[PDB]
Design a protein around this ligand. Sequence first.
Ligand SMILES: CC[C@@H](NC(=O)c1cnn2cc(C)cnc12)c1ccc(OC(F)(F)F)cc1
Ligand SMILES: CC[C@@H](NC(=O)c1cnn2cc(C)cnc12)c1ccc(OC(F)(F)F)cc1
Ligand SMILES: [Mg+2]
Ligand SMILES: [Mg+2]
Ligand SMILES: [Mg+2]
Ligand SMILES: [Zn+2]
Ligand SMILES: [Zn+2]
Lengths: 340, 319
Amino acid sequence: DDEYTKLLHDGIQPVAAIDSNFASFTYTPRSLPEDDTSMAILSMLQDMNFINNYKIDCPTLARFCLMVKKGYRDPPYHNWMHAFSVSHFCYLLYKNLELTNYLEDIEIFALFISCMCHDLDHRGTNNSFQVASKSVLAALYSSEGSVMERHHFAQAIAILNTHGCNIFDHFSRKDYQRMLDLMRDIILATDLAHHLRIFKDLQKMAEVGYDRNNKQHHRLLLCLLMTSCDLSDQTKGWKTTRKIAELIYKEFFSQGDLEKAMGNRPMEMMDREKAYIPELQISFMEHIAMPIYKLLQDLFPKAAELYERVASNREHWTKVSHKFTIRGLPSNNSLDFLDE
Amino acid sequence: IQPVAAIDSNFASFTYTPRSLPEDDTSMAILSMLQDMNFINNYKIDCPTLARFCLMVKKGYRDPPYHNWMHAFSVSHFCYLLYKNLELTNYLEDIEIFALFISCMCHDLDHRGTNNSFQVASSEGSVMERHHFAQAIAILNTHGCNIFDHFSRKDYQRMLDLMRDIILATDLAHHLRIFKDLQKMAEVGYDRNNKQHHRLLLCLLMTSCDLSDQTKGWKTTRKIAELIYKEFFSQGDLEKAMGNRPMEMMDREKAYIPELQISFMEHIAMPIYKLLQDLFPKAAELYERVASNREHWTKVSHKFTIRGLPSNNSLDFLD
Ligand SMILES: CC[C@@H](NC(=O)c1cnn2cc(C)cnc12)c1ccc(OC(F)(F)F)cc1
Ligand SMILES: CC[C@@H](NC(=O)c1cnn2cc(C)cnc12)c1ccc(OC(F)(F)F)cc1
Ligand SMILES: [Mg+2]
Ligand SMILES: [Mg+2]
Ligand SMILES: [Mg+2]
Ligand SMILES: [Zn+2]
Ligand SMILES: [Zn+2]
């Protein structure tokens, strides 16, 4: 309502007016103030021509975007600024890798909307913690798997069914179902478990080459692209990867604290007393992040700089590892911690 | 003068931690120990003079983190424990044991929280130890403070010579020089008729007093390390500001505590208490407690790696 008037009266702006480096892989979406993000979303959709392509009612689109933004909570990492930055990287893939030569317009459109919606109502805890804590989400989704991802999707649907927020209510019956299916598949691809299951399929597709006439390749690419966006904080500079590490480990240790308080022993990366950040970071870089961008590189030669930045950032984590060794007294001037 | 048992039932025991005794009761405790060893009656020490001397000594210490009155007091208390537990009268003359106790009180007088190397950056070594002794002489030459003012000319000079020697023995370099001679003495067995054996033993006893914090439990050794590193790094900070490269162990950004604690424990502290055990079977529990503390230090060495986020929540220190 208040933010609605602000957003609407701003008007859909050319992507250049935001920043000259906006469509570049070097640009950091987190540099943009949060109060400008909703306009940037609209700008990106305009630049990809999805507004005119699908004749989306602009006030409906404004309301949708504000609702999505409002649909995020404020944990250290999984907040709107994460969804925004993920969305931005999806836009970057479109502009830089020329996705129109690989996927249907409806698929790219679904990828971008999914990115906006992919962590809706995230509470800063993983799928595991929902079960352990016996949350409502576990009650709802634990037997199906990908607990959080199913909630994110359910939240996205609820937004669409909010009056004045249905950006697809003018879509053909065929296109409408397609969009819903695509959003579900893409959002569920954000579960690491899913990525790990389809990993060998992705390796096959990258080696043999992407075949645009292969409907399975479309599915797999959409998944790979979604995971690339989700992890894109690893493709920027040192400052970004380091700041993000702060937010992610903050979130992780908060969850770990809650697991100790209810009896459970949290995994190493959730435990603030046992977690060695350099080691956990490097292991994640080398074994999760880097292969995703290696696969992307093999499918799109223009993605090579992304893999190189993740590799460079991983080397930087090795370089600064030694600093986690307490020299002198701790920044406390006490040794009381030697009796834990 | 309060009897020793009235201070604490465990006051004469090796398990007693003299740092647990309130600083306001320490002067009084000094007089009690001297009373219990019977040096007051033995040497006809004037009590008011002794009272004033003790307060001048107490006042003669500055307030660095480690080298303050409480260090001197705890050192002096350990000398009393050696007397009470090992029966030093089998090895040493009464005047030598008396000199040792007074030397313990005086051995770090006017310490500034800096080492001999700080004085370098007058070059025959042991600069601070020499200063500590001069300060002891200056206190004795203070009106109403000379506890030996009634001694014979021979006994006076004897007492001063002993104090100088014992105080000079607190320098690590001195200890390392005489170490072979200490080992030989322990090897052949103590000879009471051997003047050189008396001199060497006094040096050993003093160093064992000086390092006595390592002979208690974990709490003491951990707390003392804090105080010592606090002191060492403040000197490092000062040397950096004045425009000099401090030694690695004085630099809070270079120094690794576990590697330094253990090296000190096993290479310096433990061989001293081993030699003490060799000469005094009853000192066996002391070496064991040092070895145990040395073992505990290796146990907690892993904690000097940052797990989770640092004190705050920022990885700002990485950039
Ligand atoms: C918070 C979940 C998120 N993790 C990160 O972004 C992350 C960054 N540094 N980091 C370091 C550690 C130790 C662990 N996680 C991270 C994530 C999201 C999707 C996903 O699945 C996909 F890989 F397929 F995308 C895998 C992980
Ligand atoms: C401050 C000097 C004092 N050191 C300690 O008490 C001490 C305790 N922990 N610690 C850890 C390190 C790394 C270094 N020093 C210490 C000392 C005094 C006399 C002496 O000479 C003697 F060995 F002969 F006694 C040698 C050292
Ligand atoms: Mg997610
Ligand atoms: Mg190939
Ligand atoms: Mg000294
Ligand atoms: Zn995400
Ligand atoms: Zn001392």
